């Protein structure tokens, strides 16, 4: 019943925004009273941020998998293919979650949160990449880290919604690894 | 007039959101009245796209000053260093107009326009790099030049506004250099 909220709310949002979205609509899809819906959810933002944080941690729980298990650019493509598949399949929730960065502060700590994390691992293996003589010490790794991280959120979130500009989404991963692979090993 | 109700507009969002400022507050700020105000702009948010416009239109004049006129890493430093130094010297109208991209369709468009200008740019000047010789003929240059302009377009701006994350705003040129350099001539 929290689970067919969650889903009815995902299957809408494809089709329109949340703003477009009643409490009504949410409880219908998942054959439930208002009232009801209500004893599950304080909103139909509290829905989102849900589904959200679903998203969030299924990408996160999918880098983790990796990291405690091949040559240097099939291993940063690996990585950022969870975060390509992961948001890649969720792109209503994807593109609702990055709507709401503006106007919910939980939204937006939950992003803030995630994106730290997702950093401070990217520069651990940077850092790691350094110790073994593989990749040259150029830029402060934590600093590489955010601007290669804020460019996939910027650049896979693009794709994803058919921007004007973006990297058609059939390309956008060999286009981020090149990036990556070139910045992290490139003098 | 039109000036210093540009000019109020962009103090007070300096202060605060634009949703905070009201017409009567950029009237009382050019020192006009509210209906001489609706005679020079029909709304706040007209204000702002016309703030938005001004910026984008410097940035872009302050490009084509060198497109018309040193090693390539310096190259692409001064280019880059035009963004960074033109929004980074109108942070509020830079966050504001950001804001806006979300609610005005007008700004949407206005965002997409410079950027897919700028995109091109950079693949004419990396595409005018690989026919001398001086870079490889790795990515697709269109392709390049969209990930590391929406690499600059989160990169900056979140360092504008501080963020977390987000690079600092003292080390946010040097990072966005590296990543450029290394990505454009890295095999
Ligand atoms: C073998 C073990 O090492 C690895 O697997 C390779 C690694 N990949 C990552 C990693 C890749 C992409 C992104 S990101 O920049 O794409 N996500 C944030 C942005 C949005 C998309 C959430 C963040 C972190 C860290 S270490
Ligand atoms: C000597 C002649 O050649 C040059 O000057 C070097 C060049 N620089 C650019 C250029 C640099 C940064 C950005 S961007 O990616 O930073 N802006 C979009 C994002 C936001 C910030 C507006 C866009 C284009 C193109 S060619």
Do not use: C
């Not at 949340?18 to 819906?37: E, H, M, N, Q, Y």
């Not at 880290?145 to 989404?169: H, I, K, W």
Request: aromatic share 10%.
């Amino acid at each position: 019943r929290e689970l067919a909220i969650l889903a009815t709310a995902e299957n809408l949002l494809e089709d329109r925004p949340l703003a477009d979205i009643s409490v009504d609509d949410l409880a219908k899809g998942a054959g439930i009273s208002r009232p009801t819906f209500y004893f599950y959810f304080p909103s139909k933002e509290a829905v989102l941020l849900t589904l959200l944080d679903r998203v969030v941690n299924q990408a996160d729980m999918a880098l983790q998998t990796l990291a405690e298990n091949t040559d240097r650019e099939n291993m940063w493509r690996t990585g950022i293919n969870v975060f390509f598949e992961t948001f890649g399949s969720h792109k209503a929730v994807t593109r609702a979650g990055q709507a709401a960065r503006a106007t919910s502060v939980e939204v937006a700590e939950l992003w803030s949160t995630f994106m730290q994390k997702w950093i401070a691992y990217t520069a651990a293996v940077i850092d790691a990449e350094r110790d073994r003589g593989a990749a040259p010490r150029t830029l402060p790794a934590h600093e590489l880290a955010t601007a290669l991280n804020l460019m996939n959120e910027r650049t896979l979130f693009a794709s994803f919604a058919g921007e004007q500009p973006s990297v058609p989404e059939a390309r956008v991963l060999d286009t981020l690894v090149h990036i990556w692979v070139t910045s992290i090993y490139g003098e």
